[PDB]
Design a protein around this nucleic acid. Sequence first.
RNA 1: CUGAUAACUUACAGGACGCUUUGGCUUCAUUGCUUUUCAGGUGAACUGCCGAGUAGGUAG
Lengths: 135, 303, 50, 50
Amino acid sequence: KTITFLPCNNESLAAKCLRVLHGFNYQYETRNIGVSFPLWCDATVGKKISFVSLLKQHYFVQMEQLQYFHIYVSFRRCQSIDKLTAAGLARKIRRLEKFDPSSFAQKEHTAIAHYHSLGESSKQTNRNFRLNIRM
Amino acid sequence: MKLPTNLAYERSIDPSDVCFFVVWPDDRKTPLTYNSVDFCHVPYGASHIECSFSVSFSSELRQPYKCNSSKVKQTLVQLVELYETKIGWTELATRYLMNICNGKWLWKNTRKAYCWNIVLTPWPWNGEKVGFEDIRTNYTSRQDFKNNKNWSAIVEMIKTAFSSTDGLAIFEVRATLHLPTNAMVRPSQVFTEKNSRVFQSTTIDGERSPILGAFKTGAAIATIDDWYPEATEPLRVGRFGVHREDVTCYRHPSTGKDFFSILQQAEHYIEVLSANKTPAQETINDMHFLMANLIKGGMFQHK
Amino acid sequence: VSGQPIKSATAEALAQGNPHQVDFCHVPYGASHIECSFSVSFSSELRQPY
Amino acid sequence: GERSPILGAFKTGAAIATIDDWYPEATEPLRVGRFGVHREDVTCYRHPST
RNA sequence: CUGAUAACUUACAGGACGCUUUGGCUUCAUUGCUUUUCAGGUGAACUGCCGAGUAGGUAG
């Protein structure tokens, strides 16, 4: 089904829907159901979220009671974009030591094509990351 | 007193661009580079960071650079020669030099630093480069700078530079910043008539390198103004002295203590200084603000 | 022109920011010094009027 | 192949000809010219009334 | 409710032949554009695994 948001921020709201899809897949140990957004426009991810192959989980039911809900292409994570930040460039060098560290050099000119990260976090640790998703 | 149709001075303090370097272990230096928003960070195996620039103190305050009225020209030369005799240059030269000797010209890079050191190399000088080791521990207040072995000899340079028709006083400043691993560095950035931040850069060897600008550095030496009403914190010395966190003007013309209202009272200040009764603190505060804007220079015209 | 404060220049609008554009020339970092060269002639044009 | 700052030819000849310190109240030498002007203080020493 | 009322101007056509504008010429003396100038949004999109790897993949 397609869940259409009608109240806002589509970035930090579609990322919450995937965390419920995340925690569902470790209770039941299933990896079949996938996610895609029909309105994947350049300005924003969109207000439409669909799953193909969840609505009985506690998140989607309580959000349904309020005024806001309704309840080919490939969307894959690109973790090379997580390596392009300068905190991630230092993570890359620490592995290669574990050797001249001054022999390395920055790119000084990089171009990035439409990475669309959705911000999420971990529950095993207290640590944050992003969902850099392209077509 | 009227403002003339031509009145302009030159600046008496001339800073330069600040260049950044990366010191590797076994002590070799490499100019810092950055990526492209632009982001600049310390490389991984680096030890610390050098910063270097130069400041001159070159007495342009004594006479106007351009003045089409001989009555207003003689009004300056009485003010500078009476400020020098009655008050002296010890207060302003101390307040300028403390911004060099701590890391005031290192704007947000002092932030989250382990320790930083400043080494001066004054030019009309014999030897033994003046060192300021471990600021944020050793050099906290005004009395901490005065307890240095040679602080009087460097304050008396800037006093001699202002008190002479050819005073020169060149300083070669060099800093040593010990940052955390993969730490931020915040250089200055360009002005675009428009997140989308571009750095100001030069060329050292064959590589781009961030700078901290020459006009940005002079705005950090001249954060002295605290003589305005309330005076919670120092303000960059300027006419109708503004703050830039909040877009406000303290010393507005409605206050009556901007630089253009103190110019009309500059004839009044000569008989106050030529008497024998010591002047009140409020009047001298307006004399410190009068002198610090002539060190800053600028067009002072009208019509 | 006369000398009174203009009332459109409030304390917000007078702290706004004035951008200028200048040429900037300085000495490079690793440089030693600077050469400057030209030439002069002294060639007797005052003997008779042109 | 680069642009480079000059210090011009007419500017340089003005510096060689700062000789005039015979105007009636002379302290500082002036650039030699008819009714020898001083552009520090925007006036003419050696005015035709002198 | 008009100097009112009404109104077919038509047919046909060869402008052509000829043509030297040219000679001569000194624009030239003098020249200071200058003074003063903060672009800021950097709390953060982290920490591991695989690989001989500044290649490239994936975990939370």
